[PDB]
Ligand binder design. Structure first.
Ligand SMILES: CC(C)(COP(=O)(O)OP(=O)(O)OC[C@H]1O[C@@H](n2cnc3c(N)ncnc32)[C@H](O)[C@@H]1OP(=O)(O)O)[C@@H](O)C(=O)NCCC(=O)NCCS
Lengths: 393, 303
């Protein structure tokens, strides 16, 4: 799941969480009118792309900076005209950049205090946990390194729900004072309820702070979603932005195949997540670089094999393919048949190293043998990895 | 205490099993395979389908009725993700000794709620979800694993990975060691059984003379396992433990297939798990293809 800045903040504001008032514009004129409607003393214009570093990015129009500040609505429209339709290149994008179709026109807010606040499921404590620090605007992982005494945790009981004492105590530990502490405690409760409602794995607000005018605001936030809960989060998952994803990963998502593109030249699809991780491991240990991670699940069907091959063609770095299949009550001869079928029909001539363990192996070896295709049948996983590495440069 | 239900992990020829999601596609197929293997499958449940027979076995509307009419001691769940957590809860409510949930795709929040109930009782032991199951070779098979690569023997196997299990099983069969008990705990971040739960059983089991522990990135179950081994597998009759941890080359911030297999915030790395286990006296196999030969070296070194 990937949400734009305006998508996540809309999701937060709809659930009582305080964020900057904002509009989203498709055109320069929409941005102009949105700027007027805000009635804000200062406006911030933000290009909407998923990658970071927008502030120091450059547009293909020549405009420097994807984040601009102004008190003039007309300037907002002018700058938006130099953003929308163009590509935004940052230090976290390809040099070509990413096409900007929408901009955010938000009320610019000053920040007096910056804190860190995160809500996630604690695998060890079996339930939601509040993670906070008075040191905000910083990668929290570094704070844990230098100053572990500044990381505060609150274990939440999922049935009991978040307690007022818990929300208040965290707000105090974050450094909020007086009415700002009460306002922060309330927002924490709203953030917790949002966390549960949208089936998030984590809701991370950074910075979680306050304006000089004395209001607690979630200035920036990141939301990670539980993929298992898509069936009951249809509206949210429909907002998914795949424009900054690896194209092969996107096509794999269509066929429900777990693909993660890598840096190597040895492609491999494997039934099972652990076995696939182990395959990448043992390929590396024998001096090779895996081109990808590809899990088909324990129940490996023939069509999944075909789609996998279809995916691996889109990767030009692929010089060899390691096929390792153990398990799933679809016999090996059927798998082997689907392998030969995909090889001829997809016009593939990279060498295959295939290890099949199950039933009808001898028949599978036969189907592989008389296929007249560059297919090597390995006996074990180490043998397969070595023969795959030997197949490439 | 929930730790009291650990003994229910050890299925045998006296284990009687019902199937929740009995009339479903996968529920039917693996029930047929269970009957082939010799597993005492005695019936199953499907809400609204009670009063019928399926595969020559009675179908019930509820777990409680299924348990009372069959005397079942174990339940296996092939219920779709939107309703699987409720199926687990019904099984816990009926106080079924052992519950094996196969279902992949249960919302993590659902399982957090399930675990809340699970940890506050001691009658029901849960394996899974997103797990292959458990097998006592030649005696009882509950789950997905192929039972013909198995061989009744001396090595206890516990794994967060189903397909890596099949590697460890096949290798231990090849070198003639065989398996005493094999447990797949699944690849979900919130489950009913971890490594230490099985290690407890393995250590107390006379039939178990060696242990293969298969882990991967994400969570701290491997680290907890290492701590448990330092305290409980330290003489005078300590059993050899061989391990393999997948994901040495896994990238950070990505869910590597399994929902629980992810490196986030610098935690969950494979190298730290390897280090922790080695410090606990575990022989960590660098290669997944050498689990059998490695545990063989340790086993014969037991003079
Ligand atoms: C659980 C799973 C196997 C079910 O898939 P399925 O068999 O194709 O699903 P079906 O719809 O055909 O059958 C499910 C049945 O459960 C029934 N069911 C629903 N809720 C139920 C409940 N609370 N109790 C019992 N049965 C229930 C349904 O009615 C259905 O039966 P019906 O068609 O006769 O009415 C699937 O979702 C899954 O998780 N597969 C992957 C498993 C996996 O990867 N495991 C990892 C092992 S390493």
């Amino acid at each position: 799941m990937n949400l734009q800045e305006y998508q996540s903040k809309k999701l937060m504001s709809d659930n009582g969480v305080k964020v900057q008032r904002f509009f989203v514009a498709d055109t320069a004129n929409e941005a102009l009118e949105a700027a007027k409607r805000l009635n804000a003393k200062e406006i911030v214009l933000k290009a909407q792309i998923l990658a970071g570093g927008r502030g120091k990015g450059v547009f293909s129009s020549g405009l420097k900076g994807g984040v601009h500040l102004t008190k003039d609505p007309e300037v907002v429209g002018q700058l938006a005209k130099q953003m929308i339709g163009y590509n935004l290149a940052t230090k976290q994008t390809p040099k070509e950049g990413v096409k900007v179709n929408k901009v955010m026109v938000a009320e610019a807010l000053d920040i007096s205090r910056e804190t860190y606040l995160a809500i996630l499921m604690d695998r060890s404590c079996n339930g939601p946990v509040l993670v906070g620090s008075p040191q905000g605007g910083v990668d929290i992982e570094e704070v844990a390194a230098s100053n572990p005494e500044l990381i505060f945790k609150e274990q939440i009981d999922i049935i009991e729900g978040i307690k007022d004492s818990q929300a208040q105590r965290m707000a105090e530990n974050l450094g909020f004072l007086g009415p700002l502490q009460n306002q922060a405690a309330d927002q924490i409760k709203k953030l917790y309820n949002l966390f549960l409602k949208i089936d998030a794995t984590q809701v991370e607000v950074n910075p979680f702070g306050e304006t000089p005018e004395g209001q607690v605001v979630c200035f920036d936030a990141k939301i990670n979603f539980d993929d298992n809960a898509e069936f009951r989060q249809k509206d949210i998952f429909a907002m998914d932005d795949k424009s900054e994803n690896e194209p092969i990963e996107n096509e794999a998502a269509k066929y429900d195949l777990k693909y993660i593109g890598l840096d190597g030249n040895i492609a491999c699809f494997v039934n099972g997540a652990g076995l696939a991780m182990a395959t990448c491991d043992i390929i590396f240990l024998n001096g090779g670089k895996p081109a990808n991670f590809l899990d088909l699940g324990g129940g490996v069907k023939e069509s999944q094999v075909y789609q996998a091959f279809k995916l691996l063609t889109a990767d030009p770095k692929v010089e060899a393919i390691l096929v390792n299949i153990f398990g799933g009550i679809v016999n090996c001869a059927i798998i082997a048949n689907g392998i030969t079928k995909a090889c001829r029909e997809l016009e593939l001539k990279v060498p295959l190293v295939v290890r099949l363990e199950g039933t009808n192996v001898h028949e599978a070896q036969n189907i592989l043998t008389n296929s007249g295709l560059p297919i090597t049948s390995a006996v074990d996983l180490e043998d397969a990895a070595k023969k795959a590495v030997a197949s490439v440069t | 205490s929930y730790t009291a239900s650990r003994k229910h992990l050890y299925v045998d020829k006296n284990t009687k099993v019902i199937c929740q999601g009995f009339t479903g596609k996968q529920g039917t197929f693996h029930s047929q395979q269970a009957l082939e293997y010799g597993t005492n499958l005695v019936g199953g449940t499907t809400p609204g389908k009670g009063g019928k027979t399926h595969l020559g076995l009675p179908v019930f509307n509820t777990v409680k009725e299924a348990k009372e009419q069959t005397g079942a001691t174990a339940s296996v769940i092939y219920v779709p993700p939107p309703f699987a957590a409720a199926a687990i809860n019904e099984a816990i409510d009926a106080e079924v000794p052992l519950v094996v949930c196969i279902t992949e795709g249960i919302p993590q929040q659902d399982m957090v709620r399930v675990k809340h109930r699970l940890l506050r009782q001691g009658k029901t032991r849960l394996i899974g979800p997103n797990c292959p199951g458990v097998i006592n070779p030649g005696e009882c098979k509950i789950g997905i694993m192929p039972g013909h690569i198995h061989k009744k023997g001396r090595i206890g196997i516990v794994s967060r990975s189903g397909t890596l299990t099949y590697e460890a099983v096949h290798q231990t069969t090849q070198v003639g060691l065989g398996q005493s008990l094999c447990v797949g705990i699944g690849g979900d971040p919130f489950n009913g059984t971890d490594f230490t739960d099985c290690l407890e059983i393995f250590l107390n089991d006379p039939a178990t003379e060696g242990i293969i522990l298969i882990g991967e990135i994400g969570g701290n179950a491997e680290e907890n396992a290492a701590e448990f081994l330092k305290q409980h597998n330290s003489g005078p009759k300590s059993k050899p433990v061989v391990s393999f941890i997948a994901g040495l080359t896994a990238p950070p911030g990505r869910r590597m297939g399994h929902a629980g297999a992810i490196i986030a915030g610098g935690k969950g790395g494979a190298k730290e798990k390897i280090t922790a286990l080695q410090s606990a006296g575990v022989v960590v196999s660098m290669s997944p293809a050498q689990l059998g030969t490695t545990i063989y070296k340790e086993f014969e070194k037991r003079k």
